[PDB]
């Protein structure tokens, strides 16, 4: 309840701190999910190569916004990315978002 260590982040000792390696999570953006986004976009038929192409485009989109959001986070000396860090990052990339503050 306020005891531990920190420094490098978090941790315990008597076997208690998680965080497994994160990899290949872009595959979590599934074919059904992309089909649903395309449907809301008014798309009726989709070529098989669209799914990997869409993952690639989303990865670039996310890398760009997250890069700026984390830059705001670090400049503020924080270790937690805030909704505001994301809103400002979105705004500076010309993707203004309403609903999350600011």
């Amino acid at each position: 309840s306020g005891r531990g260590k920190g420094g490098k982040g978090l941790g315990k000792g008597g076997a208690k701190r998680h965080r497994k390696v994160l990899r290949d999570n872009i595959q979590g953006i599934t074919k059904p999910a992309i089909r649903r986004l395309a449907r809301r976009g008014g798309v009726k038929r989709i070529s098989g190569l669209i799914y990997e192409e869409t993952r690639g485009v989303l990865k670039v989109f996310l890398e760009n916004v997250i890069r700026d959001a984390v830059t705001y986070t670090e400049h503020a000396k924080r270790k937690t990315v805030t909704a505001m860090d994301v809103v400002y990052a979105l705004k500076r990339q010309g993707r203004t978002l309403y609903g999350f503050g600011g």
């Binding site: 979590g28 089909r35 869409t54």
Partner: protein, 135 residues
Amino acid sequence: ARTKQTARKSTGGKAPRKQLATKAARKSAPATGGVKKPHRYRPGTVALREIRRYQKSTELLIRKLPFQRLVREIAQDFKTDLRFQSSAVMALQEASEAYLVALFEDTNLCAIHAKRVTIMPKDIQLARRIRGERA
């Protein structure tokens, strides 16, 4: 005539000209004449039904946890030891989905421009290039 009595000639007799219409394909009547039956909507009908469904709703379309792991993985590659407000992740998901949906709208316009109804990687590429995201 033949001046006798039979009542054969003509009236359906003589030869055929009556014993009409199709033979099968009503509900089943397995005698052969109409294949099987299981119900199927035609290709495109359900796709159009899904467009109407999703354009009427607003819920996020990517699963939440899988999107959250992608965000964490990418962020982690930029800077280790980050934590995220949960609304920061929802903000990224709202923005990401609105971005993709709008891009699929432009991509569809590109497929249609080429006389297709099927979007392909080159349509996405053309839309991103005209947008200035690529070249």
